[PDB]
Amino acid sequence: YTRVVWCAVGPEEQKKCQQWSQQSGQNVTCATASTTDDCIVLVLKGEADALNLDGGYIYTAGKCGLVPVLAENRKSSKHSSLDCVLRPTEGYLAVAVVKKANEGLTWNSLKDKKSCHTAVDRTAGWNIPMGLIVNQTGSCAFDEFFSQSCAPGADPKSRLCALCAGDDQGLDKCVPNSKEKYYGYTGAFRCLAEDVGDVAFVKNDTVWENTNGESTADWAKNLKREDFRLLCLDGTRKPVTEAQSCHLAVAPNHAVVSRSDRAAHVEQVLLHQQALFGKNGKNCPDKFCLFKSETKNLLFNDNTECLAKLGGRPTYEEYLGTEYVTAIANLKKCSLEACAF
Ligand SMILES: *[C@@H]1O[C@H](CO)[C@@H](O[C@@H]2O[C@H](CO)[C@@H](O[C@@H]3O[C@H](CO)[C@@H](O[C@H]4O[C@H](CO)[C@@H](O[C@H]5O[C@H](CO)[C@@H](O[C@@H]6O[C@H](CO)[C@@H](O)[C@H](O)[C@@H]6O)[C@H](O)[C@@H]5O)[C@H](O)[C@@H]4O)[C@H](O)[C@@H]3O)[C@H](O)[C@H]2NC(C)=O)[C@H](O)[C@H]1NC(C)=O
Numbered sequence: 001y002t003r004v005v006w007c008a009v010g011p012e013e014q015k016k017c018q019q020w021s022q023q024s025g026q027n028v029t030c031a032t033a034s035t036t037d038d039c040i041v042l043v044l045k046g047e048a049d050a051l052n053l054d055g056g057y058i059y060t061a062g063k064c065g066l067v068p069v070l071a072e073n074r075k076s077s078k079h080s081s082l083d084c085v086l087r088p089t090e091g092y093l094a095v096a097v098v099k100k101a102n103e104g105l106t107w108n109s110l111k112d113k114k115s116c117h118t119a120v121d122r123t124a125g126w127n128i129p130m131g132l133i134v135n136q137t138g139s140c141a142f143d144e145f146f147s148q149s150c151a152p153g154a155d156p157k158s159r160l161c162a163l164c165a166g167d168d169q170g171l172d173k174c175v176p177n178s179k180e181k182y183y184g185y186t187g188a189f190r191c192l193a194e195d196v197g198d199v200a201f202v203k204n205d206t207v208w209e210n211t212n213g214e215s216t217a218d219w220a221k222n223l224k225r226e227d228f229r230l231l232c233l234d235g236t237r238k239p240v241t242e243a244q245s246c247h248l249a250v251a252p253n254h255a256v257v258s259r260s261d262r263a264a265h266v267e268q269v270l271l272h273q274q275a276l277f278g279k280n281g282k283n284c285p286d287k288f289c290l291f292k293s294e295t296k297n298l299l300f301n302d303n304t305e306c307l308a309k310l311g312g313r314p315t316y317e318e319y320l321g322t323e324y325v326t327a328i329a330n331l332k333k334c335s336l337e338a339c340a341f
Pocket residue numbers: 075076077093204205206208209212214242243244
């Protein structure tokens with residue numbers, strides 16, 4: 001009676017779900033879809049129960065009447081008086097990153113350059129950057145601003161995927177799941193790292209997690225923090241040590257959403273699943289760890305300490321915040337009252 005069905009996006013998140021499933025006593029089983037939007041639809045239909053989402057998609061899902069249930073929490077200095085689950089989230093910092101070697105590249109000369117985005121409609125990788133740029137340009141022509149990009153989820157032979165690489169066998173070019181090589185936080189940063197783009201729109205954490213031997217991967221093991229700069233909105237450039245005074249915005253933590261008729265039931269099971277497989281669980285890191293996959297962020301971000309209860313029972317609008325939700329509306333009028341599905 002108590003069983004939850006997770007929705008996995010793409011073949012890699014599937015395999016990871018399958019393990020979680022088997023290690024759970026079929027307390028959690030799996031559904032798989034090729035895109036986040038398709039997983040949202042599975043959940044509305046009632047064939048899946050839940051998944052973890054970037055704030056940009058929480059805005060989609062919430063118009064269709066889905067609700068935040070538990071949020072991700074990463075390591076925190078302040079607020080250490082308290083327990084992670086009852087501990088307040090903070091929100092990550094969205095940044096624009098460049099090679100140090102590229103002098104002359106400022107927030108003011110981004111026109112006609114090459115760009116690396118997490119995916120279309122995501123907070124740090126899309127809504128923040130393109131919102132600012134529509135504003136400063138007064139045009140909805142965000143498809144003509146950069147010469148070429150990789151923006152997973154756009155038309156495959158527009159210039160917005162022009163830089164995307166697809167899977168081993170060259171298939172799936174710019175699909176929005178991890179088969180695409182430059183998908184998500186890690187892929188967008190790899191995109192700038194390998195000098196395919198001139199800038200990448202990721203979050204502060206991503207730079208740290210993938211420089212200075214912090215990530216054991218082939219493309220990144222020789223990357224070094226001092227080789228990068230952040231672009232600030234006042235036209236200057238700073239070390240990645242200054243993210244606190246040189247970001248584009250702060251962003252709501254990714255959160256697990258479900259259909260509201262299912263929210264209590266999902267919350268109940270997951271809090272128990274993190275007790276077995278979480279950051280200090282009975283069975284992690286012995287048998288299985290929910291918050292770990294090789295710097296991939298599969299199902300969850302790897303820097304997740306825990307899933308946190310929500311303060312005060314949010315609506316998705318309260319959780320996303322008033323500031324970020326007007327940002328999104330203003331952008332969507334470019335490309336008020338109806339589900340996308
Ligand atoms: C932008 O994002 C970054 C990435 O998250 C973030 O920095 C983190 O800051 C948090 C809290 O402010 C900090 O918290 C700690 O938890 C750590 C676990 O993550 C504990 O540290 C130990 O474990 C980690 C992981 O294995 C080791 O990580 C390394 O990275 C750095 C540099 O590569 C080095 O660590 C340090 O060495 C200095 C020496 O002076 C020392 O002062 C520090 O305390 C630390 O030890 C190290 O070379 C490693 O390669 C590390 O070795 C430790 O053994 C720790 O107990 C503490 O509670 C977290 O570590 C930071 N993340 C990382 C990976 O650097 C920024 O805060 C974000 N900035 C903004 C503005 O939001």
